């Protein structure tokens, strides 16, 4: 029977939020990193993980100039970051909303190894998720993020892990859209190992087809949904160099064969590549003549912050240089999402 | 492992053929009909079904003037129609190829009831089909057609029937593309009964999602594929009249949420509706203010040839006259494909 | 490739534990009541919900004479009951192990309604479950229990809910077997509403087929699992009464068409049945002259502990009468699980 | 809703037929030979493939003595053999019926390579099968046969081929049961290549689980079906040789974890192994102490006729020696079916 999944007011609200997030010239600042994960970046400088250090890093990232206001349409934060404040008497969500961006959140809870598989893993965080998402929404959160890590080996991935991750993302999106939060789905494939482009493209098509079949199964309202797939690049140890245009055509082909046009927008993740390479790769993505009926934007955590963290270096006086270089990189990526980036 | 479904050269060949079939301003003339099925249309006039009568009907539909040349990009015929000849020393495939259109064939073999259902059907003709498609290809047919009839009751279609039909269509498309023939997939939902628009839209989304999941499963090369879905219309007994714009938006919403942009084109059929209603409905389809990354085109057998057959009336002296009314309506369709039809 | 799911010694240990739990001449005592579920049972007497009342009730059930020692092969508890102790300062798991039974835990976390589906719910409790199961294992629990509730209406259950619950059970069993805990699976179909025996039998076959397909998908080691299905009975308000032999043959037919013989044992649940009715029904189950290769046993909650609950009545001087009636019911059920139950 | 797949009377008829075919001590004589298979077997002697030679071969096999009456409960024949007759004015169906056996038929139509797969194949013959099965049933046949070939390699079989074959077999069984014909499902895995026993066991479990899930999907009445799986043996060029008891344990484990007890009986196929080895392997399979609730029986075409074929020598005068050797091996296999064979 025809059973509705969302009342029309919810459809309109989610569509408006998703359009505001992936509006042209905008993007996602993936500043969210777990209290343990960001410790690696903090010690990369030569320092140690500290609560005030993390808060000041996120303050540096989220207190930039007007130059990035029409360039960062969404910022994703952690659970503890949402309950913090900056040196202005305002919390971080208030600053993000004032700057024009949309406050995000990472509602994942890490990965866990599976049984009877080589290196397949599944993510957790679905239990008690409706109340958590309601709490996030009442504190101010219009879109969440859930990621699944999938690795390509000599016989990986199996259909079991792919379907498991698809079901997990379907349930995640269902809960988020019921609570009133735009779900971001990231079937990320690790660009690690030694393989060519065709294998990665084929795996990406399979994963995207399974994910969208699962989404259609769970009565997901695809119009209020954002997609964050990987980029079609070879393995890290691959020696066969591929041109940027080949990467662009392979990626647009992979997205065109599986993703329905009703998806509001398709962001991207760097995947172990330098900032210049990722930015020019997405610029090539936005330079393909094929029909792309969805807004293509960027979402980089490590590609927009490595320069910022090395310039900041743990000192409270190098704030401006790190902010300036981060703004320069953000401007480069904002020009990259329209095909207007030249080196 | 990555296994190539098709070689690149035949990928380009099927892509070119599919682009030529659904080229802008063109169309599909569903001149195909079973030798037994055409008997009903012939006796509707009040005349005796005869082989010469069938051949002359096909001739009349397939010997029109230049006014329909940039309007019929493809004509579908039956098994015997290819082995026929016209009154000028030219077979029907030769006439169609010279006129500009592409010869099509119907490789279905009727339906058969299932077991333990509320009434469901699946089509046959998959076995011993590679050699038949090769024969049709060297006869002069560059694309085929397969249809699946699905009916909406109170709990139909079930998952079993939908998945079985999707598998049948996937095998059909795989065989056709292996032999070098562009497959046309027709998940026909019958507009019969008493139901509203939302139920038909939901069923259409489910069916298209299952069909495209099956196609991705069978390594189908979607770029060389044509889709022929139904129209989102209520049953003939429905007492709630819906405006044309509502039908257009519902249909474009159904097609946008499931069909990837890589599909070369999406045709349509009328079923139980008059010629003017279907033509203005497709005009509304092409006048909807939403982005559609595929060429929308028409394909009507009964909603475009009824006037021609009634004007012919079983008499050989109305040849041109029956053609004229056939031409004019076709021109209307050539105007509906671009949204330029105003009755 | 052929990736192992469990080391051989783990397989042997799980097989031994599962055989011990469901060995002939044993049973399962379902005390899997949290501090909230037991509140309704406690107030049904006319008293108040108290922690000491809960502990004394579970002491009354779990401290009994030898008459029930070869009758209860397993007692299921909740999180707090493991960390409790009797009057003589001995923990409940120690008492259960001394009496000969096997300690079990309920690792569910309630239900949550789904989106866009009528009257369907899915259970939670999978997140962070490996560490919780390890804690339960080193506490003294050797087998867990998971329940998924499914109701029967007009279009229920849908394929979505059935597959979702099957995947949840598969992940549950995978985690439990990886940690070293025998999983008990309860796809419980509510005998509520207005329907006949055939519909319930058909739904039960579908649910069990989906569950075992999911279990085979997740590399589950079926020899170390316990199945706790419903009993094939009509709805609560059915207009036609069925004989006990018909219920027995329907249940054994449903179990024989889906359950592989490698399943260690199949228990049951009351589903709104009195003590005498449930006892004679399971006696009929074991009286059906069909080849059943799995050990059939009982697992009763309210159908076996209601008389003891009312006899205890909240007073501490009625311990012996409630104990005697509970022992009588346990003896009746232990005689019923062999076909030798004399009314 | 609950829609019946078969009426109760024909349910009883199919159950009786299936029980008669797999009755204890009986067996299946695979006397079907394709025009290429029989060509190879007759050229093994060196004689010319002739219609009279084929008819005399089948007459030799199907008319031996009363000593095979309690040993051969079913004979599978080719399409042409059903319309044949012996030299005594009596057709083969009547001879088989009088002798006590049941006449079979092979309703397959060969294999066809798939697209985008290493070495996967799917069988054809489903189109126009209701009428063919009705003709076969009215001719005298009571149970059909369908052989599926699956190969084990580095990544084979894929899930696509497994699901394809499962759906093909489900449709086959549904059609046969609707026409009143007991289907025999043979998910045969080729014992060719180089692999160990565990991989073959794992593949067999996967294939059997998928096949029975498909059968449950298509409303198949499992009580009127027979199963003919591939005996769990390593590859042809396996480096490590395994004991017969290990083979029997692996086979009973594979069949017990997937096959519901409602299956009437499970036969077996030789699979490129010597005749004495096949006989002793089936004896060991019947020597396993594990509880098997289905009747195990033999079905060999090459293993029961190679000695008879070579003794016949393509001569009219060497009839009796070949007949005696064939009846001796029939007696040996009948003894092995009950676990009572000792060389």
Author numbering:
A (entry chain D), B (entry chain C), C (entry chain B), D (entry chain A): 2 to 344
Give excerpts from the publication:
The hydrophilic side of the HFBI film adsorbs protein particles via electrostatic interactions and sequesters them from the air-water interface, allowing the formation of sufficiently thin ice for high-quality data collection. By testing six different protein samples, apoferritin (480 kDa), glutamate dehydrogenase (GDH) (334 kDa), catalase (240 kDa), influenza haemagglutinin (HA) trimer (190 kDa), aldolase (150 kDa) and haemoglobin (64 kDa), we show that the HFBI film can protect the specimen away from the air–water interface, solve the conventional severe particle orientation preference problem, improve the quality of the cryo-EM micrograph by forming thin enough ice, and produce high-resolution structures of small proteins with molecular weights as low as 48 kDa.
We collected a large cryo-EM dataset of aldolase with the support of the HFBI film and successfully completed single-particle analysis. The cryo-EM map of aldolase was solved to a resolution of 3.28 Å according to the gold standard threshold FSC0.143. A nearly even orientation distribution was observed with the computed cryo-EF value of 0.84. The increased Rosenthal–Henderson B-factor of the aldolase dataset could be attributed to the background of the HFBI film. In this study, we proved that a standard image processing procedure was sufficient for particles with molecular weights higher than 150 kDa.
